Ligand binder design. Structure first.
Ligand SMILES: Clc1ccccc1CSC1=NCCN1
Length: 119
């Protein structure tokens, strides 16, 4: 039903939401999450957001090369070679991030639960 869909899902350890796919319904109201970095984890429906892509004007967190966390706003999407990129704005400047370098803080994800939450 929801298996195969791209989602943004909570990693319970640090409370942030990361890009992945529901691979399997595994019962207990849980889904097998394949994260885009290849990490795998069973995640509750309430911790999964079904937005693909993350919409324009969403508040997000960009991961740097150094795994620095920076807040920004989605102002663009681009398909390049079958892959999604996000234009993220901070302080009037925009930078391109691969799909998997865009995450949601606990509060940025919690804020999307009403419209996009699998629940
Ligand atoms: Cl999609 C992504 C991109 C960058 C960092 C993490 C993830 C997945 S969550 C996780 N990875 C390893 C442990 N938890």
């Amino acid at each position: 039903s929801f298996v195969g869909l791209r989602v943004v899902a909570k990693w319970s350890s640090n409370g942030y939401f990361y890009s992945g796919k529901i691979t399997r319904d595994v019962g207990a109201g849980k889904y097998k999450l394949l994260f885009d970095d290849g990490y795998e984890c069973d995640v509750l429906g309430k911790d999964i957001l079904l937005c693909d892509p993350i919409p324009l004007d969403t508040e997000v967190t960009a991961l740097s090369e150094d795994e620095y966390f920076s807040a920004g706003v989605v102002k663009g999407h681009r398909k390049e070679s079958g892959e999604l990129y996000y234009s993220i704005e901070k302080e009037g400047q925009r930078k391109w991030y691969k799909r998997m370098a865009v995450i949601l803080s606990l509060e940025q994800g919690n804020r999307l639960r009403e419209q996009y939450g699998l629940g």
